[PDB]
């Protein structure tokens, strides 16, 4: 029977995070197995597309969840809260790895990963479930734990677990809050209480084990929100995506009206025509994409306007979404198990290249992809 695979997602964990003494089971783990210095997530740094990334091996620019919300000539909108747009495995591209499992008979079992509710190239995990707000850190835990253990025809060679918990409580306070800082411990002895459990289970031994991020967070102060329609006016284009990302489709005959005023540098932003975006951002080329699209600056916001005023002013917040270059952006990688290399670090590196690792850890044929395998070969115990 081959080594199973813990693949963990710890949302919006920026990378420094690690080195700050709230994470005590993680830190552990690292110093156990492999730790690389960060990663960096792919644009947008937003969490359905650099969650698909993760387990893909594609840009956001190839398997097409481009952004958290969009729009297609075909299927219509796709966003988060509408079940049969996420359900439905013609907007997620490529292959990810829990398809790649159970296409060699293997199982996987995934908690809320995105993607995970649809059919993608015809095939569900055997476990899944429609994620929910609000599922205690113990039910999510025991129930991975529970899909480790299994055996017979239904075991997991793949088993995925994600916390929302880091994420939230960045938005809600920022990276440098007490509020997040204590989601990170909650979510760290979380792990903990796994690990033990795995240890009294006997599939700690035999469980290779992957914890990655999809993106840092950054501080948003207070007076950093504007209006999308600061950017440009609802009668010269549509916003069709509003937080960090900027998406407009101009009006018809609007085109250069919208870029008139739109297109270069502002205050808080800057805009491209899509296939203009800058080129290290791979991103661009994909229909999904609207024709203009702007990023805003580091630690600053753009909102619906029905947004900016029930935006309750007070307090500091957080956001990603930012040039995924950026420090503050940088995400998570540690590793460890029967398979992976003991007490070692990496170089800084490109999210992309998670996929080549999981695939051989997996005993699955590596789809193609945007990474390198070279990359992560280091990981492995040999
Ligand atoms: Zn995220
Ligand atoms: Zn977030």
Same mark, same amino acid.
């Given at each position: 029977?081959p080594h199973?695979l $813990?693949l963990?997602?710890?949302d919006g /964990?920026?990378?420094?995070?690690?080195?700050?003494?709230?994470?005590?089971?993680?830190?552990? /783990?690292?110093?156990?197995?492999?730790?690389?210095r960060?990663?960096?997530?792919?644009?947008?740094s937003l969490?359905?597309? #650099?969650?698909?990334?993760?387990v893909?091996?594609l840009?956001?620019?190839?398997? *097409?969840?481009?952004?958290?919300?969009?729009?297609?000539?075909?299927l219509?909108g796709?966003?988060?809260?509408?079940?049969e747009a996420?359900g439905?495995?013609?907007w997620?591209?490529?292959?990810?790895?829990?398809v790649?499992v @159970?296409?060699?008979?293997?199982?996987?079992a995934?908690?809320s990963?995105?993607?995970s509710?649809?059919?993608?190239?015809?095939?569900?995990p055997?476990?899944?479930?429609?994620?929910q707000?609000?599922?205690?850190?113990?039910?999510?835990?025991?129930?991975?734990?529970?899909? $480790?253990?299994?055996?017979?025809a239904?075991?997991?060679?793949?088993?995925? /677990?994600?916390?929302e918990?880091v994420? @939230?409580?960045?938005?809600?306070h920022?990276?440098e809050?007490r =509020?997040?800082?204590?989601?990170?411990?909650?979510?760290?002895?979380?792990?903990?209480r796994?690990?033990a459990?795995?240890?009294?289970?006997? %599939?700690?031994?035999? %469980?290779?084990?992957?914890?990655?991020s999809?993106?840092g967070?950054?501080?948003?102060?207070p007076?950093?929100?504007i209006?999308?329609?600061?950017?440009?006016?609802?009668?010269?284009?549509?916003?069709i995506t509003?937080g960090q990302?900027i *998406?407009?489709?101009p $009006?018809?005959g =609007?085109?250069?009206?919208? @870029?008139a005023?739109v297109?270069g540098?502002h !205050?808080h932003?800057?805009?491209?025509?899509?296939?203009?975006?800058?080129?290290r951002? =791979?991103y661009?080329?994909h229909?999904?994409?609207?024709? $203009?699209?702007?990023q805003?600056?580091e630690?600053?916001?753009?909102?619906?306007p029905?947004?900016?005023?029930?935006?309750? =002013?007070? *307090?500091?917040?957080?956001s990603?979404g930012?040039?995924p270059?950026?420090?503050?952006m940088?995400?998570?990688?540690?590793?460890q198990?029967?398979?992976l290399?003991?007490?070692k670090?990496?170089?800084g590196? !490109?999210?992309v290249?998670?996929?080549?690792?999981?695939?051989?850890l997996? *005993?699955?044929?590596?789809?193609?992809?945007?990474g #390198?395998?070279?990359?992560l070969?280091?990981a492995?115990r040999?």
């Open positions: 029977t199973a $813990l963990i997602s710890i /964990l920026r990378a420094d995070m690690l080195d700050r003494g709230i994470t005590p089971n993680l830190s552990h /783990l690292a110093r156990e197995g492999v730790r690389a960060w990663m960096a997530p792919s644009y947008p969490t359905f597309p #650099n969650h698909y990334t993760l893909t091996g840009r956001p620019d190839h398997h *097409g969840i481009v952004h958290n919300s969009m729009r297609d000539p075909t219509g796709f966003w988060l809260s509408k079940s996420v439905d495995a013609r997620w591209g490529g292959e990810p790895v829990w790649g @159970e296409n060699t008979g293997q199982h996987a995934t908690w990963w995105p993607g509710e649809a059919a993608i190239k015809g095939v569900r055997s476990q899944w479930r429609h994620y707000k609000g599922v205690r850190l113990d039910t999510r835990v025991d129930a991975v734990r529970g899909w $480790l253990a299994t055996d017979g239904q075991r997991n060679r793949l088993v995925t /677990l994600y916390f918990h994420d @939230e409580a960045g938005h809600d920022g990276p809050s =509020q997040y800082a204590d989601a990170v411990r909650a979510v760290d002895a979380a792990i903990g796994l690990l459990g795995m240890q009294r289970d006997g %599939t700690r031994a035999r %469980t290779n084990i992957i914890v990655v999809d993106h967070m950054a501080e948003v102060a007076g950093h929100a209006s999308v329609e600061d950017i440009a006016p609802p009668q010269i284009a549509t916003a509003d990302v *998406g407009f489709e $009006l018809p =609007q085109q250069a009206a919208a @870029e005023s297109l540098a !205050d932003y800057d805009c491209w025509r899509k296939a203009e975006l800058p080129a951002w =791979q661009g080329s229909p999904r994409i609207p024709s $203009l699209v702007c805003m600056h630690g600053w916001d753009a909102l619906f029905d947004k900016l005023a029930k935006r309750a =002013q007070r *307090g500091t917040r957080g990603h930012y040039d270059a950026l420090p503050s940088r995400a998570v990688f540690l590793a198990g029967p398979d290399a003991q007490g670090t990496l170089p590196f !490109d999210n290249d998670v996929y080549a690792l999981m695939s051989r997996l *005993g699955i044929p590596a789809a193609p992809n945007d #390198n395998p070279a990359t070969l280091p492995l040999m």
